[PDB]
Every structure is written in C-alpha cells, then in structure tokens.
Ligand SMILES: [Ca+2]
Ligand SMILES: [Ca+2]
Ligand SMILES: [Ca+2]
C-alpha cells in the first residue's frame with residue numbers, strides 16, 4: 617500500500633535518531649539524553665524520559681528482529697505482518713503512551729504546543745512544521761493534546777491504508 | 791457490566807500487591823522485587839523485570855490520578871471511561887506487552903507454563919489456578935503463549951462486557 621509504505625518509511629527515518637540505517641536501543645538512548653539536556657522540564661522528568669523512550673525498544677521493537685538492529689526493509693516487512701491482525705493492534709499501538717509520557721515534560725497529562733514543538737525539534741525537524749501535525753491531533757481544538765487524541769491519531773497513522781490528516785503524525789513524509 | 795466490574799475489581803486486587811487498598815508505584819516495585827526472588831533467571835533480566843513492571847505505573851496508571859495512589863472506585867470509574875472509546879484501546883491494553891516482557895524471564899519471546907506459573911504464584915495465587923488461564927490464552931494448543939496470544943486474551947479480559955473464557959486472565963475473580 618503506497619502511502620502506507622511511505623508512512624512507515626517516514627516513521628523509520630524519524631526514529632532512526634543517529635541516522636545509521638538501523639533502529640537500535642541506541643537511537644532511543646541518545647534521543648532521551650538529548651531531550652533531557654535541551655528541554656525545560658520538571659527535574660524528575662529526566663529519568664521518566666529515559667525509561668519511557670528506552671521502554672519503546674525494550675517492550676516493543678525488541679520483538680522485531682529479536683534483540684538487534686532493524687533495517688528499513690525488516691521494519692516494513694515486520695509492521696506489514698503486525699497490522700494484519702485487528703485483534704493485536706496494541707502491539708503496534710503500545711508505544712504511543714510511552715512517547716506521550718516522555719513528551720509531557722511538565723507532567724500535567726496534556727501535551728502543549730511548546731512541548732510538541734520541542735518534540736519535533738528532538739527528532740531533528742524544523743519547529744515550523746509542528747503546527748500542522750499538532751492541529752491534526754487536536755480534534756477538540758482546546759490547544760492541548762490529551763493521551764486519547766494522541767493515541768487515536770497515532771493509531772490512524774500506523775493503521776490507515778488510505779490518506780488521512782494523521783499521515784503527518786511524525787512530520788513531513790519522505 | 792456486573793461481570794465487567796467484577797473483572798476490574800479482580801485486576802485491582804491483583805495489582806494491589808501490598809493490599810493497602812491503593813495502587814501505587816510501590817506496588818510494582820515490591821512486585822518486581824518478589825518476582826526476581828521467586829524466579830532464578832539471569833542477572834540481565836532482573837533489571838528488565840523492574841523496568842517493565844514499574845513501566846506499567848509510569849506510563850499507564852499515572853494517567854489515572856495525576857500520579858497519586860488509586861483507590862478501587864477511582865480505578866473502576868476511570869476504566870469505565872477508558873474503555874468507552876475503542877479507538878483509544880491502547881491506553882488500556884498498552885501494559886500487556888510490558889507484563890509479557892517481565893514474565894518472559896528467558897527473553898525467548900514466549901511464555902512457558904513454568905514462567906506463567908511463577909507469574910501467578912508471584913501474585914499470591916496458587917500455581918494450580920494457572921493452567922485454567924494458560925489454556926484459555928493458548929489458542930493454538932502449542933503449549934506456549936506468544937505475544938500476540940497474550941495481548942488478544944488480555945484485551946478480551948479488559949474489553950469484554952460479557953462472559954468469555956478470558957475473564958480468568960488475572961486469576962480467580964473476587
Ligand atoms: Ca539508528
Ligand atoms: Ca504537558
Ligand atoms: Ca485537544
């Protein structure tokens with residue numbers, strides 16, 4: 617599925633933090649460390665960040681190539697299989713809440729525009745691309761992202777075979 | 791809803807590891823600690839256990855009371871709200887992969903009867919209560935619970951308003 621392959625390629629890109637062509641725990645370790653240095657947050661949030669981002673690999677991605685590096689082909693091949701069973705979606709969707717927890721640096725349980733902008737910036741993206749993605753997730757227009765909005769949009773990104781506004785969940789498509 | 795409420799109360803009973811009437815991070819920490827004692831896995835897995843278990847609280851239950859200890863009624867009402875929007879199911883089911891990762895002490899991506907049994911024993915249940923639940927989960931009778939099998943069963947537990955074989959997912963109902 618064209619657009620669907622394109623979304624996976626995009627996600628792969630954004631999460632391949634060190635850009636070496638393979639998803640590894642190292643990507644999440646480094647992303648966390650940068651995030652902890654450069655963002656404003658509650659002091660205790662630095663540990664949360666590390667646990668939650670590394671937990672993406674530890675509890676989810678580790679199951680893809682059983683322990684090591686995931687190349688772009690294996691990623692797509694793997695996800696392709698994973699989305700097949702409508703009853704096991706949480707294996708694909710599971711990481712959203714962890715991403716959410718890391719991004720909520722003031723731990724108020726909502727993601728604000730500033731927190732989202734910082735997130736895009738951690739992924740190496742131009743902060744000026746955040747609003748279009750934020751806006752797609754903020755369905756009630758209250759100017760915040762609730763856990764519910766975040767997971768619903770993220771779920772759409774991963775699962776929709778067709779075009780939707782959530783195709784830009786992880787920034788601009790490659 | 792009567793049975794659903796019963797299941798929620800049962801999940802609540804189970805995770806309230808100390809039995810103080812409140813679910814707190816400490817529950818998971820103490821559970822982590824006892825889990826490690828009861829199994830006799832390799833060193834590297836000890837940390838996995840801790841990380842995985844506390845991760846249930848850190849990323850999922852903290853969304854319930856802004857970080858404080860959750861009482862039974864608060865728990866059930868939250869759950870009632872959470873299960874209403876099926877598109878957001880991952881907030882509820884999100885923890886299953888975490889539990890899986892903790893229970894698979896030999897990091898082989900499968901849960902054996904031994905491993906499952908330690909999990910039950912761990913939770914204050916007698917290992918004879920286990921086989922009942924195992925077999926409900928092992929839908930292809932190959933004597934191993936795969937990640938997919940674990941989350942499908944767990945999801946039925948959480949989401950089925952009606953009776954099903956998976957109501958015993960967390961052991962005998964209270
Ligand atoms: Ca990488
Ligand atoms: Ca926030
Ligand atoms: Ca909103």
Ligand SMILES: [Ca+2]
Pocket residue numbers: 806807808809810811812813814817
């Ligand atoms: Ca407790």
Ligand SMILES: [Ca+2]
Pocket residue numbers: 894895896897898899900901902905
């Ligand atoms: Ca195992």
Ligand SMILES: [Ca+2]
Pocket residue numbers: 927928929930931932933934935936939
């Ligand atoms: Ca099986």
